[PDB]
Amino acid sequence: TYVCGDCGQENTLKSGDVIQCRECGYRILYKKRTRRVVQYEA
Amino acid sequence: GLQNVFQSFGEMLVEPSWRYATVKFGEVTVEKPTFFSDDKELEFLPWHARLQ
Ligand SMILES: [Zn+2]
């Protein structure tokens, strides 16, 4: 899963050539946080 | 600033030795920074140039 910049739309394109977003001419992809259980210390 | 640069130069006549060449420059027109992508000419922002 990779949310793109300048528009709210996930891509999930884990390919060796796909680097841009669908229906959007920009090529900046932010990795989306997956809801996993991590722990910290207070 | 660009007109004083492109207007203070004098192009010499291209004479190798009839048929000769003489080129000149006119008005200076600077466009806006765009993105030449595959879809169209998108808007180009200063953080797009910083991230890419
Ligand atoms: Zn996009």
Swiss-Prot record, chain A:
One of its GO terms (biological process) is DNA-templated transcription. GO terms for molecular function: DNA binding; DNA-directed RNA polymerase activity; zinc ion binding. Its main location: nucleus. Belongs to the archaeal Rpo12/eukaryotic RPC10 RNA polymerase subunit family. It is found in: Nucleus. Keywords: DNA-directed RNA polymerase, Metal-binding, Nucleus, Transcription, Zinc. This is DNA-directed RNA polymerases II, IV and V subunit 12. Zn(2+) binds at C4, C7, C21, C24. DNA-dependent RNA polymerase catalyzes the transcription of DNA into RNA using the four ribonucleoside triphosphates as substrates. Component of RNA polymerase II which synthesizes mRNA precursors and many functional non-coding RNAs. Pol II is the central component of the basal RNA polymerase II transcription machinery. It is composed of mobile elements that move relative to each other. GO terms for cellular component: RNA polymerase II, core complex; RNA polymerase IV complex. The keyword Disulfide bond does not apply. The chain holds residues 9 to 50 of 51 of the full protein. It comes from the Eukaryota. Component of the RNA polymerase II, IV and V complexes. Associates with the mediator complex. Interacts with NRPD1.
UniProtKB/Swiss-Prot annotation, chain B:
Disruption phenotype: Blocked in the perpetuation of CNN, CG and CNG methylation in repeated endogenous DNA. Reduction of heterochromatin association and methylation into chromocenters, coincident with decondensation and losses in cytosine methylation at pericentromeric major repeats such as 5S gene clusters and AtSN1 retroelements during interphase, independently of siRNA accumulation. Altered cell-to-cell movement of siRNA beyond the vasculature. Reduced 35S promoter homology-dependent transcriptional gene silencing (TGS) in transgenic plants. Mostly expressed in seedlings, flowers and roots, present ubiquitously, except in sperm cells. It is found in: Nucleus. It comes from the Eukaryota. Disulfide bonds: none annotated. Belongs to the RNA polymerase beta chain family. Component of the RNA polymerase IV and V complexes. Interacts with SSH1, NRPD1 and NRPE1. This is DNA-directed RNA polymerases IV and V subunit 2. It comes from Arabidopsis thaliana.
